[PDB]
């Protein structure tokens, strides 16, 4: 550690107190150095004989990713901002899915925590689902109270607590049979592959292929590193830092 | 083909009818036989020239594998009404998570869809949310207006029309700091690994514990394969076999 040590003090000095200010709430550190780095976190010391141990948002396994696991833990005060980068990321992130999850409110007056196969056209994003399911009494009687959520697997993500996640207000609407229709059922049939009973459903007349308007949006892709969506405007959460423990 | 055809023929007549009668809604159907077998499915005929094809919920990549998929398929029918079987499914899917899907009803109206990481104390779940959060409005002013859902994940899942899933009506109350507390978030950290910020956020004092009793629940394994369950009762949804296209 004492090469990282003498390299983070030459090259991440303001980036250290960025992390001191955001994750700690230190806003005036003095003689601000690097203690120390291991597979959890590392230890940032400053002022008067102090330090603020910061976590990694995932073990670092091999004690040879400890530099790089650390460099990227500095740089990403300043990448927080990227918000063109942020923007990109949201596209590319719900383009890895085939499946949303949903909260509906249903006709019995309980809300309705369920998910159901994704698919579009061109911006266009739907969901299939059965009247058969609980979820359709609440996309039919209240189409305007849903929220859609994109989830990472958890076998994907950093760690249970930090899943990526991206949720929209949403006003569905019902698309009838047709050329839409088609448009989106070929272009999932292509992108899955269309088999394990894609076929199938697709001639079941009990579903139907409704269309997701999203409104407000929510996005976290890291600590301290969650966005507000609304049409193409995208706002970063947090100017005022850690606003956890009563902040 | 014809190996298969004459196998399925002599010990699985049975089930073919059972399966046509499940996925087809055919129930008078004679001159019952397995016709054919592919990647992606089976075909059986009956009567004097009709067919109905039954989709497998993944592709068969290996020809090697179409008998012994088949087989499955036809056994499954009878496999479906194993509840002992559902019930030591039901309690292995839980156990296999680190976190849950949550709906909740914010107190503007409006509903919540968002996810939180679950803990446990043996049979008793526990989620743990922080009240920066959009749902902690709802899991404090509607706590008694939850739903809680197991969702297994899409890269793991037979197909993205087949993710399994485990959701229940779920009561929630909060759960003061103490020896309760520790128990669930030591016994969290030790199943975890406890690293990624798990240590953090235990000193968050924003961070509530809180714990989940469930009500009803849905269980979906399979086509055709879904269970209500209350308490210790578990019972089979699909006697009347496939509800869709409207079959009432
Ligand atoms: C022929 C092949 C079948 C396919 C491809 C199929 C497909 C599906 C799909 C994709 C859903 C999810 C709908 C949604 O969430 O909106 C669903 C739900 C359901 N299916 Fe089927 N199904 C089939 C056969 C059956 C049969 C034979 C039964 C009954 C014995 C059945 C009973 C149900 C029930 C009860 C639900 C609602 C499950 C829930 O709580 O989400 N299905 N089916
Ligand atoms: C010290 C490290 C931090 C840890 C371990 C941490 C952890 C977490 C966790 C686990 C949640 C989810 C809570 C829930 O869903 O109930 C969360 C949410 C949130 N955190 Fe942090 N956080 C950290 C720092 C920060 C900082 C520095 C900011 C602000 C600049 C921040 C802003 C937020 C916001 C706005 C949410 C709500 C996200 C949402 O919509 O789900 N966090 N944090």
Same mark, same amino acid.
């Given at each position: 550690? $004492? %090469? ?12 250290? !107190?960025?992390?001191? +200010? ?18 959890? &976190?590392?230890?940032?010391?400053? $002022?008067?004989?102090?330090?603020? %141990? ?6 670092? +396994? ?5 530099? $790089?696991? *650390? ?65 359709? @009494? ?18 994907? @993500?950093?760690?249970?607590?930090? #899943? +990526?996640?991206? %949720?929209? !207000?949403? $006003?569905? %609407?019902?698309?009838?049979? &047709?050329?839409?229709? =088609? ?7 292509? +992108? *899955? &592959?269309?088999? &394990?009973?894609?076929?199938?459903? #697709? @001639? ?6 409704? @269309? ?5 949006? #929510? ?12 049409? =193409? ?15």
């Amino acid at each position: 550690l $004492n %090469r990282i040590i003498e390299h983070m003090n030459a090259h991440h000095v303001e980036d250290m !107190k960025g992390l001191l +200010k955001k994750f700690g709430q230190v806003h005036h550190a003095e003689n601000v150095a690097f203690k120390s780095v291991d597979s959890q &976190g590392i230890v940032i010391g400053y $002022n008067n004989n102090q330090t603020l %141990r910061i976590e990694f948002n995932h073990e670092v +396994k091999d004690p040879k990713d400890y530099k $790089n696991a *650390t460099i990227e833990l500095c740089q990403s005060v300043e990448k927080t901002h990227d918000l063109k980068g942020v923007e990109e990321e949201v596209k590319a992130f719900k383009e890895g899915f085939d499946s949303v999850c949903l909260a509906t409110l249903h006709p019995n007056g309980h809300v309705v925590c369920s998910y159901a196969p994704l698919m579009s056209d061109g911006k266009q994003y739907y969901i299939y689902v059965s009247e058969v399911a609980e979820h359709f @009494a609440g996309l039919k009687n209240n189409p305007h109270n849903v929220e859609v959520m994109f989830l990472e697997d958890e076998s994907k @993500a950093k760690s249970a607590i930090l #899943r +990526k996640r991206l %949720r929209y !207000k949403t $006003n569905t %609407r019902f698309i009838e049979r &047709g050329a839409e229709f =088609d448009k989106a059922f070929d272009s999932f049939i292509e +992108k *899955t &592959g269309g088999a &394990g009973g894609i076929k199938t459903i #697709r @001639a079941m007349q009990d579903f139907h292929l409704i @269309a997701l308007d999203f409104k407000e949006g #929510r996005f976290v892709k890291g600590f301290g590193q969650a966005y507000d969506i609304l049409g =193409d405007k995208i706002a970063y959460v947090g100017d005022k830092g850690n606003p956890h423990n009563f902040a």
